[PDB]
């Protein structure tokens, strides 16, 4: 997923909050950093670890849902892409 991408301020700070530097990422990098954010903030359920809690987290504001499952791949990519701007470039 080499899609060249520039997050909107809120996703961007979400990513920067766990140490990302740039304004301009591949989709791959975004996914790496987003998974890290979720683990670093301890948003995943301990027992059913595909479940992610977003209530009173920043992640809830971006995604507009209180919880979601990582198994919902299309929904996940939809909720990401619409916090994201696709550049006119590789």
């Amino acid at each position: 997923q080499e899609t060249l991408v520039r997050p909107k301020p809120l996703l961007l700070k979400l990513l920067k909050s766990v140490g990302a530097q740039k304004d301009t990422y591949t989709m791959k990098e975004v996914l790496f950093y987003l998974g890290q954010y979720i683990m670093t903030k301890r948003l995943y359920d301990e027992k059913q670890q595909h479940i992610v809690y977003c209530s009173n987290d920043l992640l809830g504001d971006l995604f507009g849902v209180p919880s979601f499952s990582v198994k919902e791949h299309r929904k996940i990519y939809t909720m990401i892409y619409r916090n994201l701007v696709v550049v006119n470039q590789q």
């Binding site: 997923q1 989709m27 791959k28 996914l31 790496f32 998974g35 979720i38 683990m39 995943y44 670890q49 595909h50 992610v52 990582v70 198994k71 791949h73 996940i76 990519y77």
Partner: peptide
């Protein structure tokens, strides 16, 4: 069980 990390890796890396 499956780790969250493992679930997340399946999204696409």
């Amino acid at each position: 069980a499956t780790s969250f990390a493992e679930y997340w890796a399946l999204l696409x890396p």
